[PDB]
Design a protein around this ligand. Structure first.
Ligand code: PHN
Ligand code: ASP
Lengths: 157, 157
């Protein structure tokens, strides 16, 4: 014996196998979130430029930042697909189902804001309560993280 | 049964010591980038609102938004302090170094724009090259994730 947080190599390797998977699935959800907030930033960046005051030229001035929001949303959907494809560990089943619901709602909302700016509808872009769908997903993400944490801690025992 | 990824309980334990610290480092770094990105979305949602009410809409949430970016920015810096307070691992020292530089620089970009927006000066806001610096830190963070992953893989088979 010369081991300390684990009762045997079997136990130790067990915890590794369980944690390395939690680590993969939490990684895809960090990237999803990152590129979804990147999409909301590019959308704001497009709209401010849309809004710069030439006269009757109106709110639609050379914005290649909307294609940029279309790209970061597609990449977040790519990271999300990997997670979605990864079946929940039993203990995780419900934390993930919650993150999928809050995610389908916030991706819809961002895709909805791209079509608004795409058709020049500024008021609809400004009026969407995007912040609540984001806060909801942020809160289902910290909960999924509490629940991985708990399972991670149960390995060194 | 199975097949082992570790030649002994000490080899396995040694990987856990490394991995668990890497895990913590990375948690605070992701939490810094998150909050910096919500500061950016708060600032940009305020700057688009500062340009309204001029034959266009609502405007009034732009200082709630500006007060909320001061908070996410203070939360971002407290997270980075946790990360700075941690033991830099030899394999991570260079990556860590590159992250500090780019961090320091974007935190300070963000803080100037809060100031410009407090003064109501839109022109100062758009004259600042924020996105450059944000992409710079996204890059350094990607590299750090890349070098972090390398060290973690060598912890097993
Ligand atoms: C490498 C990486 N993670 C670990 C180990 C080795 C060993 C055990 C273990 C237990 C719980 C969580 N992670 C690990
Ligand atoms: N509703 C959009 C745009 C805005 O309010 O500025 C958002 O929250 O991103």
């Amino acid at each position: 014996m010369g081991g300390l947080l684990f009762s045997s190599l079997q136990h130790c390797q067990q915890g590794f196998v369980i944690s390395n998977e939690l680590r993969q699935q939490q990684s895809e959800l960090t990237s999803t979130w990152d590129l979804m907030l990147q999409t909301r930033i590019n959308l704001s960046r497009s709209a401010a430029r849309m809004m710069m005051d030439a006269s009757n030229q109106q709110s639609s001035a050379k914005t290649d930042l909307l294609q940029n929001a279309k790209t970061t949303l597609a990449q977040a959907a790519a990271h999300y697909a990997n997670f979605k494809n990864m079946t929940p560990l039993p203990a995780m089943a419900e934390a993930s189902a919650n993150v999928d619901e809050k995610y389908q709602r916030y991706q819809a909302a961002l895709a909805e804001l791209i079509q608004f700016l795409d058709n020049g509808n500024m008021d609809a872009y400004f009026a969407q309560p995007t912040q609540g769908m984001q806060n909801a997903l942020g809160e289902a993400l910290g909960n999924y993280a509490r629940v991985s944490e708990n399972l991670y801690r149960q390995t060194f025992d």
